[PDB]
Design a binder for these strands. Structure first.
Ligand SMILES: [K+]
Ligand SMILES: [K+]
Ligand SMILES: [K+]
Ligand SMILES: [Mg+2]
Ligand SMILES: [Mg+2]
Ligand SMILES: [Mg+2]
Ligand SMILES: [Mg+2]
Ligand SMILES: [Mg+2]
Ligand SMILES: [Mg+2]
Ligand SMILES: [Mg+2]
Ligand SMILES: [Mg+2]
Ligand SMILES: [Mg+2]
Ligand SMILES: [Mg+2]
Ligand SMILES: [Mg+2]
Ligand SMILES: [Mg+2]
Ligand SMILES: [Mg+2]
Ligand SMILES: [Mg+2]
Ligand SMILES: [Mg+2]
Ligand SMILES: [Mg+2]
Ligand SMILES: [Mg+2]
Ligand SMILES: [Mg+2]
Ligand SMILES: [Mg+2]
Ligand SMILES: [Mg+2]
Ligand SMILES: [Mg+2]
Ligand SMILES: [Mg+2]
Ligand SMILES: [Mg+2]
Ligand SMILES: [Mg+2]
Ligand SMILES: [Mg+2]
Ligand SMILES: [Mg+2]
Ligand SMILES: [Mg+2]
Ligand SMILES: [Mg+2]
Lengths: 125, 175, 175, 49, 205, 97, 110
RNA sequence: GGCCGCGCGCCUAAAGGCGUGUCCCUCGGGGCACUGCGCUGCAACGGCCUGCGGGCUCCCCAUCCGACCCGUC
RNA sequence: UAAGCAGAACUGGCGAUGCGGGAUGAACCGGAAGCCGGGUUACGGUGCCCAACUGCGCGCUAACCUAGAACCCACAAAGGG
RNA sequence: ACUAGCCCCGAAAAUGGAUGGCGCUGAAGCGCGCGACCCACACCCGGCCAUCUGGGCGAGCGCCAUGCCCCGAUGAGUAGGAGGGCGCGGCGGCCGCUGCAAAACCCGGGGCGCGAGCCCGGGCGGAGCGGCCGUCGGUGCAGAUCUUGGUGGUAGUAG
RNA sequence: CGCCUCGACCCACGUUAGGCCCAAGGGCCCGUG
């Protein structure tokens, strides 16, 4: 429907915390790992080095988990799970699960149009 | 720095204010979320203050828009707060327009416009929605060209655009 | 003025031994009153045997120049500490106030002898008639037909708005 | 508040009269010692005794 | 020190009788701010301290050299314009691309080669020797120092500069005749339109 | 000016702005200090309830002094900042408040 | 002289010097700008609040135009000699330092 | 630089605002005041909306500033 | 003899700590810290590198020894003119 | 004659060299002042996240009460401790998906979360898989001259 | 040297213990569409 959220969504950091030295080594993955070496520049927070996540970066409680379309996401797998958003259609949007087939996607997209529930990936498959 | 609510009087407004008890005033749909209804706001936003150097008949240089630098005579300040200006349309080709108080500079040169009628010109006249506009413009210059001819060289002054040249410091110029 | 002259008055705390102690006065040069009282208690402790904890501060008053529009000759007797030892010296100055002479004295000691303000004790200040001046460079300005040119002009714009990085010709200056 | 405001004056003024009278008869009037301080910390909290 | 702010295509500075390090300081700020600077007559720049002090300073600099490969080591330029170029480079972050671009906006010459012989050459007031140095203290000219340490084009610079000054002296005589003609013209044109120019009288200088 | 612009009370160990007189009443009313003028009078004229009034005041959080200092490392009589200035604390309060 | 181009000039030319800086770090949220003719901190106050435009030519066309604009305003003086601090909608690219900026008079108090 | 919750149930006035009675204050004109119930998210205007438009947490490059290789004793 | 040596007393610090200054540096000076916007300071500075005066004012110095130029600190003496 | 400021002599090492460099001589040096300015993650005001402190909410029109709302202060961390979460594989239950295409894998695709991670899109592939509650475990890798396997530069070189 | 598939306006030398000056702090330009 029309999103009920009116407070502007601000992000303290639209940027990922990539694991230190994952650029240097192919086998190191980008998922954050807290450095723990005794001499670590990144652990010791020298300027110019990789940044470390902390609780001060957290987002406003009123706007956290809201998608860019100002709705909050709920993943459905069939029609019955989609019926649960009819009373929350102004605050929640529906995403059809990744493994739901094209036949059932038609049924969920039809029922959500009747109920005025927004489906984020209704044009898929 | 006046304290309007300096005294607990509140009765110089409603002197005969001893009045009786107030009388307080199907949806066909229920919105599923308690949304406070939107009523019109009862706040008066205190209309904008005119710059003290802008007085009726004073000359203005336009600072932006398609008429940037046009030397123009000031007529009136509209209810919305935009100044009413005319070129006049004969000398510099600037028609009757309303301009923001910013984007103009008030010079110290003045013109008498006392015997000029600018009454039908107001915010509604400029509502976004022409032959009669040509007539109104035509009948407002001939009431103003003569007063421009009254002062020597004022006609060629109003028909020239203001510009900054080499070595010109806008923060030192008197205007 | 950087330096001010103060008259500081104090005494030892009235005790049953005396109960009407003697009064002590000093003329001290300081930048404000708090620094004048501290220097007073410094000399009372070292010259008499009364320190601030056993004493009372009675009065503090600033002395002013009688005629700050004439030029006086000012002699100063001082005590200063060098890197190796203590020495006393006599200095002479020309100023419209004795405040200027004391500022001159402190500046000269800092330059010619690298002596800072703490290492200086003003023994005596006075005004000297031009007949009795002792140091040269004070008598040579007692000429009634004093005449000379200005050999260093300091070519500069007046108010820093007229400053430019480049100029079209070299300055002409003469004396 | 009226009483306090008028008490700040006649206290400053009285000290002006007392000092003048002391000079009038040739003496010194000693002002009462200060009873109040305002104290502000000017150094940080590192390396403290 | 900030830039001139004069925002021209290029400023031509007559370097004669300026202090070397004070001139280089101002020019370096101009180049770093985006101005193109052309410095002419770099052979007559002045350095405080006479020839002897300045000459041994260069000789100590001439001592510096990479022991294992001198053509890699410091390059010791002998000309006055390249000496001033290196003095300015020392005041610029020249190993960055910004300082590389800044130093590319500087042109330095000995004498006044064309077309700058017919353009306007300015001066820097706070680099001029007459305002910077006491009249009794020693100093030397850049060309004299350069001549002492290996520069060999001082004679051709001097011969060219004499030829230029002859041509400028003739152009000066012609300009004086045209100025006297101009003053007569403004005198005759003053009465012919005497009434119109009344408003110019109080601001006539 | 210190108590008006930077006045905070201690109510239940909490730092409460003295925006109205009810805060001062509910803090120091039992000592016959009703409003912000009584509080100012008690502090300025050190009275029978200075201990209760002063301790009720949360320590003032002054800004960095506009215009700077001279030398925080030595005394005021040496040309620095530390120590007793006795009247020039008012000039210092002007720039820190 | 018969010239072509702009007929009037209602702006003064500023040059971008850089960023708010110390000896060891820099801040893009404010730029340092030198305005022609402004030589003192005192006469900077006239220009405080005045709108500023940085004009550069991009590589593609956007509205059948190859020129882009970034808008800012003069915020305060910087130092004693007329340099000013300016805030733009987006931080200026460091490549723009040394280039020209246009200082208008659009918000006028006089 | 960040924020957007007085006004009307009397009249006139674009609107800011003015207009009642009482006691006191003097030296011309104000001051402190009547206090009765209710309702109670600041505005104006513009350009644009399928486009060479807007955005981007993605990719590449440029520039300025910052930046020494991790683990270990 | 001394040592960036070896050993004790009180306190602080580094180790366990980033950040601003001392060009650079575990310990020196300032100051300790969630992610940010605006204002102002500390130490230290305002010719360029480098943000901020070639600012206002008085003297001293002339180094034909690489004159001199920031606590710790990166040296200088007796003695001479 | 003595005294003390700056300056000079006294004053010699090995790569070429360092008031940090360029340079500076009514200094851009030394001593002493004045006014402004620059400038830290320090101080002040404001927003947001978390920790801690203190409160409000039933003859309930009443609530993930393990919730929501209000108030104030606070936020460095090796060794170490603890809490709350993320992920892997089973078992007991519950709720589902999939030949109208499951798992795995790939992608300058789009997002959510401070983060561990998660969700979706497009492709490949062709038969299985997931989420929630409880419980259990051979349960999370960058190092160990770590194990096994595969692959580089060296290198079209030594020869 | 040979051979060809945003008005971007402005020229004195020289000296400052000297050549009216005491900064281009000027001058010029329809500067006006
Ligand atoms: K080890
Ligand atoms: K499980
Ligand atoms: K050829
Ligand atoms: Mg994110
Ligand atoms: Mg899928
Ligand atoms: Mg300390
Ligand atoms: Mg600078
Ligand atoms: Mg050679
Ligand atoms: Mg300030
Ligand atoms: Mg300081
Ligand atoms: Mg200390
Ligand atoms: Mg250890
Ligand atoms: Mg360690
Ligand atoms: Mg700030
Ligand atoms: Mg100077
Ligand atoms: Mg050092
Ligand atoms: Mg000796
Ligand atoms: Mg240095
Ligand atoms: Mg905060
Ligand atoms: Mg912590
Ligand atoms: Mg640990
Ligand atoms: Mg790839
Ligand atoms: Mg699984
Ligand atoms: Mg198992
Ligand atoms: Mg295992
Ligand atoms: Mg492995
Ligand atoms: Mg490991
Ligand atoms: Mg190995
Ligand atoms: Mg192997
Ligand atoms: Mg191999
Ligand atoms: Mg071979």
């Amino acid at each position: 429907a029309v999103p009920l959220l009116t407070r502007k969504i601000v992000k303290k950091r639209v940027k990922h915390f990539k694991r230190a030295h994952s650029d240097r080594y192919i086998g190191l993955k980008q998922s954050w790992r807290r450095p723990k070496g005794i001499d670590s520049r990144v652990r010791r927070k020298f300027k110019g080095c990789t940044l470390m996540p902390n609780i001060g970066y957290g987002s406003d409680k009123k706007t956290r988990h809201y998608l860019p379309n100002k709705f909050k996401k709920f993943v459905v797998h069939n029609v019955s799970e989609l019926e649960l958003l009819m009373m929350h259609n102004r605050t929640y949007c529906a995403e059809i699960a990744h493994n739901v087939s094209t036949k059932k996607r038609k049924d969920i997209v039809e029922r959500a149009a009747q109920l005025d529930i927004v489906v984020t990936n209704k044009l898929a498959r | 720095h006046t304290y309007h609510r300096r005294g607990l009087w509140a009765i110089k407004a409603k002197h005969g204010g001893a009045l009786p008890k107030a009388e307080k005033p199907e949806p066909k749909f229920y919105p599923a979320d308690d949304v406070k209804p939107r009523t019109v706001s009862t706040r008066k936003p205190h209309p904008t203050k005119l710059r003290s150097t802008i007085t009726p008949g004073t000359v203005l240089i336009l600072l932006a828009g398609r008429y940037m630098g046009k030397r123009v005579v000031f007529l009136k300040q509209l209810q919305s707060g935009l100044l009413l200006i005319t070129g006049p349309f004969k000398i510099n080709g600037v028609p009757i327009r309303r301009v923001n108080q910013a984007y103009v500079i008030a010079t110290s040169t003045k013109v008498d416009i006392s015997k000029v009628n600018v009454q039908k010109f107001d915010d509604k006249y400029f509502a976004r929605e022409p032959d009669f506009k040509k007539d109104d413009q035509k009948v407002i210059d001939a009431e103003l060209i003569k007063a421009i001819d009254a002062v020597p060289d004022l006609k060629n002054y109003l028909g020239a655009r203001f510009s900054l040249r080499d070595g010109d410091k806008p923060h030192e110029m008197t205007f | 003025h950087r330096f001010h002259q103060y008259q500081v008055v104090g005494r030892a705390l009235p005790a049953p031994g005396d109960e009407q102690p003697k009064i002590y006065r000093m003329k001290l040069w300081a930048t404000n009153e708090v620094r004048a009282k501290s220097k007073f208690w410094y000399f009372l402790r070292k010259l008499k045997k009364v320190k601030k904890a056993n004493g009372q501060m009675l009065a503090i008053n600033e002395i002013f120049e009688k005629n700050p529009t004439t030029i006086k000759n000012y002699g100063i007797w001082l005590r200063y500490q060098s890197r190796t030892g203590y020495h006393n010296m006599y200095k002479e100055y020309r100023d419209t106030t004795l405040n200027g002479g004391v500022e001159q004295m402190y500046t000269e000691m800092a330059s010619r002898h690298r002596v800072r303000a703490p290492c200086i004790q003003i023994i005596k200040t006075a005004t000297v008639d031009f007949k009795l001046c002792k140091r040269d460079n004070t008598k040579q300005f007692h000429n009634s037909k004093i005449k000379f040119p200005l050999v260093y002009q300091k070519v500069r714009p007046p108010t820093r708005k007229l400053k430019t990085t480049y100029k079209a010709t070299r300055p002409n200056l003469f004396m | 508040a009226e009483q306090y405001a008028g008490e700040y004056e006649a206290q400053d003024k009285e000290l002006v009269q007392l000092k003048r009278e002391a000079r009038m008869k040739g003496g010194f009037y000693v002002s009462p010692e200060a009873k109040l301080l305002f104290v502000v910390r000017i150094r940080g909290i590192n390396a403290m005794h | 020190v900030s830039g001139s702010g004069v925002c021209a295509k290029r400023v031509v500075v007559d370097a004669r009788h300026h202090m070397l390090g004070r001139l280089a300081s101002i020019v370096a700020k101009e180049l770093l701010n985006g101005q193109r600077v052309v410095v002419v007559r770099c052979e007559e720049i002045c350095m405080s301290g006479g020839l002897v002090r300045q000459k041994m300073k260069y000789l100590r600099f001439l001592r510096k050299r990479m022991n294992t490969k001198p053509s890699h080591g410091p390059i010791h330029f002998r000309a006055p314009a390249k000496i001033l170029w290196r003095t300015i480079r020392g005041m610029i972050p020249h190993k960055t691309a910004r300082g590389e671009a800044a130093l590319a906006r500087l042109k330095a010459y000995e004498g006044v080669p064309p077309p700058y012989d017919r353009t306007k050459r300015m001066v820097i007031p706070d680099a001029l020797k007459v305002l910077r140095l006491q009249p009794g203290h020693r100093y030397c000219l850049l060309g004299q120092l350069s001549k002492e340490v290996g520069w060999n084009y001082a004679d051709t610079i001097r011969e060219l500069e004499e030829k230029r000054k002859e041509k400028a002296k003739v152009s000066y005589d012609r300009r004086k005749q045209l100025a006297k003609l101009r003053v007569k013209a403004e005198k005759a044109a003053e009465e012919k339109l005497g009434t119109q120019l009344e408003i110019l009288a109080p601001i006539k200088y | 000016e210190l108590i008006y612009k930077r006045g905070y009370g201690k109510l239940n160990k909490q730092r409460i702005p003295l925006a109205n007189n009810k805060v001062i009443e509910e803090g120091l009313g039992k000592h016959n200090i009703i409003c912000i003028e009584d509080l100012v009078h008690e502090i300025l004229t050190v009275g029978p309830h200075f201990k209760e009034a002063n301790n009720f005041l949360w320590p003032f959080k002054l800004k960095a002094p506009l215009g700077g200092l001279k030398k925080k490392r030595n005394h005021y009589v040496e040309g620095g900042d530390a120590g007793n200035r006795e009247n020039y604390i008012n000039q210092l309060v002007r720039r820190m408040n | 002289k018969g010239r072509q181009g702009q007929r009037v000039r209602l702006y003064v030319r500023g040059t971008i010097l850089g960023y708010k800086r110390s000896k060891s770090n820099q801040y893009e949220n404010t730029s340092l700008l030198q305005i022609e003719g402004v030589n003192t901190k005192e006469e900077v106050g006239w220009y405080a609040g005045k709108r500023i435009a940085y004009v550069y030519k991009a590589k593609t066309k956007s509205n059948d135009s190859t020129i882009r604009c970034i808008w800012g305003k003069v915020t305060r003086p910087h130092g004693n000699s007329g340099v000013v601090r300016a805030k733009f909608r987006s931080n200026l690219p460091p490549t723009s330092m040394g280039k020209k900026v246009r200082v208008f008079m659009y918000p006028s108090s006089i």
